[PDB]
Amino acid sequence: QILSPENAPRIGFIGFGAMASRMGDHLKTAGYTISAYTPSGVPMLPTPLALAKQADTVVVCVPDDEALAASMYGENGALAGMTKGSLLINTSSVSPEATATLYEAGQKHGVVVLDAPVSGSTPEADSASLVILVGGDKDDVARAAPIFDAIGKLTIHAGPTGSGARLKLVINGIMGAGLTTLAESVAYGLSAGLDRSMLFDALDQVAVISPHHKRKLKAAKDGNFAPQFPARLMQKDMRLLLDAAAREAVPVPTLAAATQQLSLTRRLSPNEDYSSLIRVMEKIVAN
Amino acid sequence: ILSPENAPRIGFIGFGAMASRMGDHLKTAGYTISAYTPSGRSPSPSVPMLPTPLALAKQADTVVVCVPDDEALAASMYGENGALAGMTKGSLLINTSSVSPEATATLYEAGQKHGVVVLDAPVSGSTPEADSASLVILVGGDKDDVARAAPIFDAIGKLTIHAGPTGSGARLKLVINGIMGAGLTTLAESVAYGLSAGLDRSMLFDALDQVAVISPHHKRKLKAAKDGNFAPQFPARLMQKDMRLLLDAAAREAVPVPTLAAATQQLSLTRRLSPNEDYSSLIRVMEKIVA
Amino acid sequence: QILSPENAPRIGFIGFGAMASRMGDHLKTAGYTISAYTPSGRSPSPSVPMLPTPLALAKQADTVVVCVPDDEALAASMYGENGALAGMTKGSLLINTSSVSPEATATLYEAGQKHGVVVLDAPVSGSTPEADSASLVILVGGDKDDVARAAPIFDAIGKLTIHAGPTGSGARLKLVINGIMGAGLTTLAESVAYGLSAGLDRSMLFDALDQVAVISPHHKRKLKAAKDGNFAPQFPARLMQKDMRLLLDAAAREAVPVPTLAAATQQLSLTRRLSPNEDYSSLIRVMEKIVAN
Amino acid sequence: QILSPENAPRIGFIGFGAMASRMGDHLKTAGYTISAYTPSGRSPSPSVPMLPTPLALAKQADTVVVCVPDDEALAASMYGENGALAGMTKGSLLINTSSVSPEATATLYEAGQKHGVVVLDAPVSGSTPEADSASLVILVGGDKDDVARAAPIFDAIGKLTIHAGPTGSGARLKLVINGIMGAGLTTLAESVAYGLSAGLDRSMLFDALDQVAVISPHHKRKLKAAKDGNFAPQFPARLMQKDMRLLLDAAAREAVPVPTLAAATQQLSLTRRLSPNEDYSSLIRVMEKIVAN
Numbered sequence A: 001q002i003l004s005p006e007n008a009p010r011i012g013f014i015g016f017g018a019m020a021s022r023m024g025d026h027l028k029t030a031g032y033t034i035s036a037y038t039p040s041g042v043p044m045l046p047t048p049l050a051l052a053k054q055a056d057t058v059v060v061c062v063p064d065d066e067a068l069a070a071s072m073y074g075e076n077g078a079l080a081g082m083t084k085g086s087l088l089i090n091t092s093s094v095s096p097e098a099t100a101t102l103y104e105a106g107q108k109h110g111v112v113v114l115d116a117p118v119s120g121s122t123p124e125a126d127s128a129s130l131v132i133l134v135g136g137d138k139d140d141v142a143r144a145a146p147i148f149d150a151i152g153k154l155t156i157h158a159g160p161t162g163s164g165a166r167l168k169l170v171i172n173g174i175m176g177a178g179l180t181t182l183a184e185s186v187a188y189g190l191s192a193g194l195d196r197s198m199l200f201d202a203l204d205q206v207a208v209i210s211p212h213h214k215r216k217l218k219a220a221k222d223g224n225f226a227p228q229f230p231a232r233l234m235q236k237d238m239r240l241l242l243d244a245a246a247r248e249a250v251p252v253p254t255l256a257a258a259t260q261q262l263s264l265t266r267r268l269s270p271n272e273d274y275s276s277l278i279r280v281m282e283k284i285v286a287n
Numbered sequence B: 001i002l003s004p005e006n007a008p009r010i011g012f013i014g015f016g017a018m019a020s021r022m023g024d025h026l027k028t029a030g031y032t033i034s035a036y037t038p039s040g041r042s043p044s045p046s047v048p049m050l051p052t053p054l055a056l057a058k059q060a061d062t063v064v065v066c067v068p069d070d071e072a073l074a075a076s077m078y079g080e081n082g083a084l085a086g087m088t089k090g091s092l093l094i095n096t097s098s099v100s101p102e103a104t105a106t107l108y109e110a111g112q113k114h115g116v117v118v119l120d121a122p123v124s125g126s127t128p129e130a131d132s133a134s135l136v137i138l139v140g141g142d143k144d145d146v147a148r149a150a151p152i153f154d155a156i157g158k159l160t161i162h163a164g165p166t167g168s169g170a171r172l173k174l175v176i177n178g179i180m181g182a183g184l185t186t187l188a189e190s191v192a193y194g195l196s197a198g199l200d201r202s203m204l205f206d207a208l209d210q211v212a213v214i215s216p217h218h219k220r221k222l223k224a225a226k227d228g229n230f231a232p233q234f235p236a237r238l239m240q241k242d243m244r245l246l247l248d249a250a251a252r253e254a255v256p257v258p259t260l261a262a263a264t265q266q267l268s269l270t271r272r273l274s275p276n277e278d279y280s281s282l283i284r285v286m287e288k289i290v291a
Numbered sequence C, D: 001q002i003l004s005p006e007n008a009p010r011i012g013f014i015g016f017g018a019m020a021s022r023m024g025d026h027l028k029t030a031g032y033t034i035s036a037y038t039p040s041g042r043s044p045s046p047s048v049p050m051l052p053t054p055l056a057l058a059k060q061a062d063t064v065v066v067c068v069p070d071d072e073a074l075a076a077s078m079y080g081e082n083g084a085l086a087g088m089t090k091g092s093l094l095i096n097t098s099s100v101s102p103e104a105t106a107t108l109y110e111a112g113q114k115h116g117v118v119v120l121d122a123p124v125s126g127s128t129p130e131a132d133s134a135s136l137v138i139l140v141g142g143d144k145d146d147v148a149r150a151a152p153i154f155d156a157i158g159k160l161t162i163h164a165g166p167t168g169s170g171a172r173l174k175l176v177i178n179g180i181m182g183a184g185l186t187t188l189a190e191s192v193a194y195g196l197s198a199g200l201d202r203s204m205l206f207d208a209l210d211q212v213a214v215i216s217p218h219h220k221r222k223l224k225a226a227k228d229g230n231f232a233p234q235f236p237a238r239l240m241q242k243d244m245r246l247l248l249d250a251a252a253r254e255a256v257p258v259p260t261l262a263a264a265t266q267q268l269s270l271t272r273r274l275s276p277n278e279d280y281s282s283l284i285r286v287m288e289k290i291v292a293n
Ligand SMILES: NC(=O)C1=CN([C@@H]2O[C@H](COP(=O)(O)OP(=O)(O)OC[C@H]3O[C@@H](n4cnc5c(N)ncnc54)[C@H](OP(=O)(O)O)[C@@H]3O)[C@@H](O)[C@H]2O)C=CC1
Pocket: A014, A015, A016, A017, A018, A019, A020, A037, A038, A039, A040, A041, A061, A062, A063, A064, A066, A067, A068, A070, A071, A091, A092, A093, A094, A118, A120, A121, A122, A228, A229, A230, A233, A237
């Protein structure tokens, strides 16, 4: 009962933005028929219910808990439109609480919900280099493998339901605080009189910055903050992680500070790349 | 022009984990090595030891300094027994220690009064990179004096960054130290959340090796931390000192750095609990909090 | 319209813990008849009749006062087949003194509107000693006319009613005050810890700080208690840390950078992990232990 | 040898700014003869003779009081052939009221000992209004008998002398109180900022916070001034942020984790960068402007 294009050709999306649309292109190449629902308007369906009624597998890619609940539940929601025995793959970055609510609601419809957020942004989605972080029973993960293989380079089975959502929060913290650390360290360097191009070029050559953050640093050198992961979404992910860390009573001061810097970043420019904090701190130092 | 032919003798003020490793690559490149340490001992028993900084400098052509902090630097640089009193006008002093911008300016000016150019040339990389001569040299000074020292820098490292005039190497080292320190505290806290939320420890450590948002340095520390291996490459006492220097400098420049400030406090706790183990032991500290 | 004991004698509580039980005694003294629902069926007041469900509580009260720990407990007891809201008559008032999120507040206000029920968000400034002495400060969101209706209830349990604005304003003002209280304590605990680490005599240091103008009366009381190792719960760490989580979530939703509040929250997470049930001021003891090793 | 006006009438000041000139007024009233040295030779007190060097100041004074901004200024005027120590006599007392580091305090104490001069580290709690009213709290480190020698001086300028311990204890206790003051302000600025960002009425919010028990009297006075946009300096951001820098350096040297104090320090760096000379409470305005955009 693998979800190959032979057994399950129709994949309906709930949400179809920068990430899901690039996933869909890869699933199309792999031989699936793609449909999609978005509250605004590949064939578009009018409701989540209608989307689910004409799909074999539903993939969800929505911004937050509120959007997830608005489209999963109620008589016009996605769950009302799928059939016992089918699978719902949620690739959204949402809270552990929302993950548990949807898993339990899926169980009442006979629908297995995999929490399968991804590591990687729009360039990795373009190249199908996403890393899938999936929670669920190993047998249900196996059913979704052709889907995961088409959109990504690696599927990490993180544990039972909820484990993928948690692993995504871990990686989001590392990403977000990695950027705020870099912006702050660059700002000190500029404030202490270091030549800007020297400094940016020097940091490209050290081993203590990630490949992801080195790519952001190079873009920031030219002032390029075209959105790959917009500040509004990075800051939301930081909010979710801090809430989850507080619920577990784990003290995370570096992540907490980073979140506040990303709040400023979102306020000043919600739609540019989250790396624009580098420019924000540069402007603080120049004034 | 400080090739082994022209200037074969390199004397070290301080000769511990980093400097003894640099000394081996300089020995291999053809230089004659000598050292001073306050204890009279070092990891390299085959290196002649001199009784004072003054005595070390009087029998070396170039002096390399590698001491723990500002206070150690002033103790061995100044006064009638210090290194400056022993070097000759026109020679180079190369400071690879991680010290404050204030200490750097004090030594440069003191050097000028002796006719000695002081390059502030801290390095990026730890004991594994010193072993393999993969250090990145971060050097402040005039471009002509930097060119004079290139044979020395090439022997101990894989890249020399001319950061600007005197003081620029010290500042760039502070920048890179902040990225390293807060990179570790970020990773320790993120791992701690994951464990507190029920993720299998072995799965989580292995999964994070697979993602592009952790640096190669911090991936190596995560693998060591999976093994409980915190043998000192960069001890907490020195990493936390370096964070203290960075936050002092950021406050003097009035630059708000909340992520770096949070990370420093986590590294204070790390040093308090274990000053001599690797600074990455914060990962173990956080694991014990969540247990 | 005024919810005096003559016009509306029956006050039913959803939640009846440390704070609500003390408000109930002042409401009993003012002439009201008190009833309550809790999930355990128990309360600090054995004389108070217990109803078996939130719906049953609401069906036999003229006014309902809610005092529950968090958003989840609120939703569990106001909504669903046995929730309290559907048990209330049109034109009646629901008074929520719980410290919950602005989102939970907006959801309850809108659900109340659908049922014809006015919901006042009326959290309180003060802890169990202020509840004991009816010296709470009520922070209330709603229309002036609806606040006026609740005035005899607010007057019995508190010393001052601040009309913070329309619906949601009380909840927001409570979060502001919570932030000041939480970070005031973490600031004090960390400053004391430096002092002790630098060799200052403990008794001298605690007494000296009682003499300075830069500590609040509330935190000076906590400092004297901490000198005695007295962390009997007035505001337990589990609830203070929850309130800080709510404040940081709200500040993130508004995109306001609050690094001092964010750091304080992490210190209170450690405090709650080590002792969820003692007073939140126990971080002072936590920090003393860190510097002693 | 009590340092009464009859026993030691001449008090010479090293530094004579906002704090010291007010101290000197109260010492003049108490019967002392005041002189001063400043690097600019300028001071708002016309009756105070200005001496041209720290050396010259100390040579014509019986007791020397120091009130300089930081470690660097202290070392410039204390040491060397033209410094103050070179001009005082064995058996005299130097009273340092400056807010300086523990390291600077130890260095001056030991330098004083080589000169036979006892150095009391005696920073003060309180700002320009407290110096005007001699309401300062003196925080003094040293031997009990030397503190007793300085009692008439301390009584003239303040309302309370806290003997914090041996040499260095006053410097450390000042750092403790500075942290409480600075983080108390940043907490308050961020909490107000959240409340405004969440739509609360500004005048409502400022007036409500004046009524709560979790804000100190000092910070309530700052909040009232901020309601009017008044940040005329009493304690300028450049000096408060310097004191926070000293506290965080000392906390790092003691390896004490203080995340709330560290976060507050960074907010006060932003405050100093935007306006070094206005009152440190100007962060309230900084945060209002962030939220207003
Ligand atoms: N680099 C990245 O972009 C990363 C993204 N993620 C996560 O992936 C998810 C989406 O990312 P991205 O695709 O970039 O975000 P986008 O904002 O680009 O796409 C958002 C999509 O969600 C749709 N949507 C909004 N509300 C609803 C709703 N109530 N029901 C159904 N669909 C809805 C929008 O449709 P409309 O146009 O009608 O609003 C749009 O199609 C988020 O959870 C994000 O955090 C995680 C890591 C990295």
